[PDB]
UniProtKB/TrEMBL annotation:
Belongs to the IS150/IS1296 orfA family. It comes from Apilactobacillus kunkeei DSM 12361 = ATCC 700308. The lineage of its organism: Bacteria, Bacillati, Bacillota, Bacilli, Lactobacillales. This is Insertion element IS150 protein InsJ-like helix-turn-helix domain-containing protein. Coiled coil: none annotated.
């Protein structure tokens, strides 16, 4: 169900190989948010303070 928000979940994209790539993690964000890092964003490289 397209969330009341603007960026609906259906807006999510899909690829050939990346299909399962994000479908595994994205499933967490897109679940309620959308096709993007929101709930639990992956770990970023060593950020130099």
């Amino acid at each position: 169900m397209k969330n009341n928000k603007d960026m609906s979940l259906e807006e999510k994209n899909k690829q050939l190989e990346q299909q399962v790539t994000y479908l595994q993690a994205k499933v967490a964000y897109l679940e309620k948010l959308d096709a993007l890092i929101q709930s639990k964003k992956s770990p970023t490289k060593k950020k130099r303070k």
